[PDB]
Amino acid sequence: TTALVCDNGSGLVKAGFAGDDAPRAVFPSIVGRPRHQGVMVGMGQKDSYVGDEAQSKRGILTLKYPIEHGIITNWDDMEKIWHHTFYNELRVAPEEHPTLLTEAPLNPKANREKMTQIMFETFNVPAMYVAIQAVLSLYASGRTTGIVLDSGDGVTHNVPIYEGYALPHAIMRLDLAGRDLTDYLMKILTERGYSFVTTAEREIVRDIKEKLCYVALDFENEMATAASSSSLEKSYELPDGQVITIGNERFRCPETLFQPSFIGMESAGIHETTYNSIMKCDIDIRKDLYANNVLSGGTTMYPGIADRMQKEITALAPSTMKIKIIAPPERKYSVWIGGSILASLSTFQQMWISKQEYDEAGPSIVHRKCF
């Protein structure tokens, strides 16, 4: 039979059968209970709208993501999300399909063990396998080397790989991602008068960020230009009218990636954690990693980031090496495409964690040889 390549993610759940080009169903991972009282009788009001249904009734719900930073903080809601994904968005019972979840690097063990225990006890799948979210993004590019920066919505991690041999001592995981950029944008919009507070209006700020923000090639020049002319002010229409005008908030929101001091984080930007991740590698594979830097994940879709990052790394790196940044147009679904490719391989067909194996060793089987 065919395998189910699910990809929990944090912000958008992407799923679909193995062997295709794009995920079959992509929908936000939010579960929102209603918060008001409700007076109409017999309206058929449910107790929790999940997935894309709660992005249409969000006016009277309190949306809450079940995955904070890679890790899962609310297991009941995550179980609900998985149940919805299997039964309503794909309509395939899990009793007859292997599953291939994905997990960020350096995550707590208990999260992974609970994930496998749920998949084997509640949904009762035949066999499931958990894979690191960066190796798949490297599969999708058709490479076999390279250092991949997978800046998702929950957590940004940077896994270097050479000739198929991952370097476990050079993984640099940073917890700044799209959600923190949404919060920072929502916080700097208040400087013009627009106040978004409700958990429903966070979605509106996210839409503003997606449609308007861009990464500046040079920050100081853009700050000077936006403060003199008015060629940058782009307007946007809220879900009820009252258009708003975003000035130099456009390139200040995604600039937080390269200067995490804006949101008070100590660490260095995504332009310098990649160079540090490279320098921890051996001295003889640094040229190949320099030449095959891969971008993935949703948050790396800002217009103009593949040039800013290349300029920064070229500034840091030695002058002789060639710096090349691979930015495929299908960046958002790169991890899932790689997952489909991996699940479609014949050599991989015996790596699944078969159910009888789980019955013999318990949920701690995932840390064992079947990784």
Partner: protein, 51 residues
């Protein structure tokens, strides 16, 4: 509606066409850049040999 229908269909076809064009052209630009870089490495080899 019918007017909207035709508008929607035509815009969708145009969008898909542009996407396919730009994707294939991206593949082409990748290939030509590979040509350039690999040729450059040949250049370096030749330079070392001659010197």
């Amino acid at each position: 509606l019918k007017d909207a229908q035709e508008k929607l269909e035509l815009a969708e076809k145009k969008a898909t066409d542009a996407e396919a064009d730009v994707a294939s052209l991206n593949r082409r630009i990748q290939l030509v850049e590979e040509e350039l870089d690999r040729a450059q490495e040949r250049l370096a080899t030749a330079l070392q040999k001659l010197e």
